């Protein structure tokens, strides 16, 4: 299945205040009226992280609880694991071996090795969630926006949340799910466990020129793609 993303994927590229002027930015943005992959949670395959992925999800029970990043799923090279919880998030880049299926919260699916980096911050989490991941300049950027509510037609600019100095090579990524009372093995089947009925979206970024319209308070009210 596919869904066309109407006016989503617009974030703050320069982190500066501009009052009532229009800026032509040449960066990586999601083009308007482009198709995204649509999935239903009620097993997920691996998806390529080419040069940036716009993530979108409309949930009502908080079933997705993070992501996995890294150029390989094995323990030969450093992968990334972000898992969210009810109180805090832990960002953890240290190359643990993962299973063929992500974990369902069995609160551990990782082994020990050389471990490097760890991060504590504020918690990242009908309810609509959008996330953009980027790695061009060796800095991990996440732009997020939570709006109460297929995808709606309302425009919404996405504010930057964190900015990590890790510069790990990322080629592949994988989403996380959570289910009540789920035990997992090193060898998994395709059955799984029952969860709430919801859906999530995955987009792709391309380098496009965007004329963002800034408001009086520095907010992005509208955006125009050049090659649309």
């Amino acid at each position: 299945a596919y869904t066309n993303s109407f006016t989503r994927g617009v974030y703050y590229p320069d982190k500066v205040f501009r009052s009532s002027v229009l800026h032509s930015t040449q960066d990586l943005f999601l083009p308007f009226f482009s198709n995204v992959t649509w999935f239903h949670v009620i097993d997920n395959p691996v998806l390529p992280f080419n040069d940036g992925v716009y993530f979108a999800s409309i949930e009502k029970s908080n079933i997705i609880r993070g992501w996995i990043f890294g150029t390989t799923l094995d323990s030969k090279t450093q992968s990334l694991l972000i898992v969210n919880n009810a109180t805090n998030v832990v960002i953890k880049v240290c190359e643990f071996q993962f299973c063929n299926d992500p974990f369902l919260d069995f609160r551990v699916y990782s082994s020990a090795n050389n471990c490097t980096f760890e991060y504590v911050s504020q918690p990242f989490l009908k309810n609509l969630r959008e996330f953009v991941f980027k790695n061009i300049d060796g800095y991990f950027k996440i732009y997020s926006k939570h709006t109460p509510i297929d995808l709606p037609q309302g425009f919404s600019a996405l504010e930057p949340l964190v900015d990590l100095p890790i510069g790990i090579n990322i080629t592949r990524f994988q989403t996380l799910l959570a289910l009540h009372r789920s035990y997992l093995t090193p060898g998994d089947s395709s059955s799984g466990w029952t969860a709430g009925a919801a859906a999530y979206y995955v987009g792709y970024l391309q380098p496009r020129t965007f004329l963002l319209k800034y408001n009086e308070n520095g907010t992005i009210t509208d955006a125009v793609d050049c090659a649309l």
Binding site: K15, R18, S19, F117, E159, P160, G167, N217, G218, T219
Partner: protein, 289 residues
């Protein structure tokens, strides 16, 4: 005077009747202020040298630093400070340098043997137990604390290694129990003559000399890998004056201009605002926000 400057700007000794643009007036700045955010994540070297537990010579730990702000100027309050021969980098300029990650090597060394751990040296523990490279960036932190960590009944808990047949390359370890091989001899598996097993121990005494004293040697090492630097040193002093033509420097962006109170409501993720046609209009205070 502005009459002769008008004769200077037109290159003629006689000027005629009329208005002439001679120069441009510009106010020179009086002060210069730099500001930086607070020292929130202070560096935990207090676990390293202010601790009471310490490691042995061969059983040294390696404790790494990921994200912190550094402070080496307050570390000189210690009384047994006597050795700080730094390697490659002067100790004054290290406070402005910003590196990626810091590793510490914590152990105890015989006080007569502290001169062997140096670039371009040979000795007992230098070629066989622990060596630093010649491209090393860091210094040694050595001090005597025999008043606190010893008793008259025998402080031989800190062990050491005298010799082995091979030469350990740096940046690895060995807790290997290996038998001495002198020549035409098989391995028995138990100690005795010509089976000199290298499990040794020092002779720590509180009155044991003044030059043969325990020197708690901490060799702190700095590494760069052509990466964006994370470990920042102790920053410059933060001072602020308003309504005066001063030099502003708020995490970069050096220039000249006055500072006035504003009225708009900015978003919290914004750091510095830019006006039309790429001119910096407003930069928020990194300290008082």
């Amino acid at each position: 005077d502005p009459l002769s400057e008008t004769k200077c700007t037109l290159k003629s000794f006689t000027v005629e009747k009329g208005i002439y643009q001679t120069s441009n007036f510009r106010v020179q700045p009086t002060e210069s202020i730099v500001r930086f955010p607070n020292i929130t994540n202070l560096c935990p070297f207090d676990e390293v040298f202010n601790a009471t537990r310490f490691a042995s010579v061969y059983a040294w730990n390696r404790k790494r630093i990921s994200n912190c702000v550094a402070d080496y100027s307050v570390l000189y309050n210690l009384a047994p400070f006597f050795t700080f021969k730094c390697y490659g980098v002067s100790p004054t300029k290290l406070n402005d340098l910003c590196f990626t990650n810091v590793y510490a090597d914590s152990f105890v060394i015989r006080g007569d043997e502290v001169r062997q751990i140096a670039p371009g040296q040979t000795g007992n523990i230098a070629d066989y137990n622990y060596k630093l490279p010649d491209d090393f960036t860091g210094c040694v932190i050595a001090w005597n604390s025999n008043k606190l960590d010893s008793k008259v009944s025998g402080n031989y808990n800190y062990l050491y290694r005298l010799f082995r047949k091979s030469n350990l390359k740096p940046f690895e370890r060995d807790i290997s129990t290996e038998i001495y091989q002198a020549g035409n001899k098989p391995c028995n598996g138990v100690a005795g003559f010509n089976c000199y097993f290298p499990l040794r121990s020092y002779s720590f005494r509180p009155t044991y000399g003044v030059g043969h004293q325990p020197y708690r040697v901490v060799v702190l090492s700095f590494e760069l890998l052509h990466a964006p630097a994370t470990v920042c040193g102790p920053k410059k002093s933060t001072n602020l004056v308003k309504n005066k033509c001063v030099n502003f420097n708020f995490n970069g962006l050096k220039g000249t201009g006055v500072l006035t109170e504003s009225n708009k409501k900015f978003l919290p993720f914004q750091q510095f605002g830019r006006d039309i046609a790429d001119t910096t209009d407003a930069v928020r205070d990194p300290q008082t926000l």
